[PDB]
């Protein structure tokens, strides 16, 4: 035994399966219109962003 003691600290992580509860009609949402914008057009592929 050396002259000093010592304390030790771990961490530990636990998977959990939650129960979210949400009361009625709390958040009002606003849904817009989807647009499309091209990018990275090649002679091999035409990619799109929506």
């Amino acid at each position: 035994h050396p002259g000093f003691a010592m304390t030790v600290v771990r961490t530990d992580e636990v998977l959990a399966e939650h129960i979210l509860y949400c009361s009625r009609a709390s958040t009002s949402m606003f849904v817009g219109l989807p647009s499309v914008v091209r990018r990275e057009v090649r002679s091999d592929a035409v990619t799109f962003e929506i």
């Binding site: 990275e40 057009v41 090649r42 002679s43 091999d44 592929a45």
Partner: protein, 300 residues
């Protein structure tokens, strides 16, 4: 609106063995001497200039690549190859099938260089037509300016060891030149010292500079004395070695010194550009598992 496609026909059908090698590189970059869609076989490689019977060249290839049109394979069908045309500033895709394998990254600048390594790494021989197609050496620009340099030093000291044995050590020469460090990684290149005749023309040029330059810059300083002399030229007198500034220019006459100063600059601009400017293209996306790089060509 414009249509670009390059479709080369052949005279004879392909063998079953030669089809699997071009299927291995179904994406590649071929130089191609003509811009039209219909064309014969004798241009799409490097067999138009470089061949086995002719002496191997570096510079006449590098003169040729910047003058040449590049193209990309799409689909290999017997016997009609189907290349796609490369445009100025056009976005397309490259698969990286080149021997030896250098690893590509995105946001690197690809530089098309001529092949100076082994034959079976570079070319694929077509036995049906008796003509050799040659795939160039696509290497990133910082490697291509460094894989050239150590092999050009290795070519010089190979010329010294063949003239006198005592000046060059082989262990000192091999370990410092054939191992090339780039991006944290190391590549041991194939030496092919089995008998580097590609690089003999550059090793003739850089030496003929290296004698004429210190003889040349002495006369060019002393001839420009003015009261309107540029003030940075007073600083560079400390840079030149002291043994350079002790040349008796009474030894070489005026009809000799005009021939030197014209040989002085005419090698310089012919050697400056062949390190600088070739077909060089950018890459903005890459994936190692798919081995496919999205590129775009900058013609210069």
């Amino acid at each position: 609106a414009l249509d670009k496609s390059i479709v080369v026909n052949l005279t004879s059908r392909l063998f079953a063995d030669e089809l699997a090698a071009l299927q291995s590189k179904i994406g590649s970059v071929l130089p191609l001497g003509d811009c039209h869609r219909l064309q014969n076989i004798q241009a799409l490689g490097l067999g138009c200039v470089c061949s086995r019977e002719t002496s191997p060249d570096y510079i006449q290839i590098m003169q040729y690549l910047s003058k040449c049109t590049l193209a990309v394979l799409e689909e290999v069908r017997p016997d009609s190859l189907r290349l796609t045309r490369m445009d100025p500033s056009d976005n397309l895709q490259i698969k990286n099938v080149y021997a030896p394998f250098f690893q590509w990254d995105s946001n690197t600048q690809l530089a098309v260089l001529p092949p100076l390594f082994s034959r079976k790494d570079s070319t694929i021989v077509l036995e049906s037509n008796g003509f050799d197609i040659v795939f160039p050496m696509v290497v990133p620009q910082q490697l291509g300016h460094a894989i050239l340099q150590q092999l050009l030093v290795y070519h010089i000291y190979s010329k010294i060891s063949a003239g006198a044995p005592g000046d060059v050590n082989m262990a000192e020469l091999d370990l410092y030149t054939t191992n090339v460090s780039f991006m944290g990684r190391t590549y041991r290149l194939d030496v092919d010292n089995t008998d580097l005749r590609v690089l003999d023309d550059l090793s003739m040029y850089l030496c003929i500079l290296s004698a004429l330059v210190p003889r040349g810059c002495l006369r060019l300083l002393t001839a420009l004395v003015r009261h309107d002399r540029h003030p940075l030229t007073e600083v560079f007198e400390g840079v030149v070695p002291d043994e350079v500034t002790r040349i008796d220019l009474d030894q070489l006459s005026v009809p000799d010194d005009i021939t030197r100063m014209r040989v002085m600059f005419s090698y310089l601009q012919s050697l400056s550009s062949i390190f600088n400017l070739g077909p060089r293209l950018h890459v903005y996306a890459y994936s190692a598992e798919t081995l496919a790089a999205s590129c775009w060509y900058s013609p210069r």
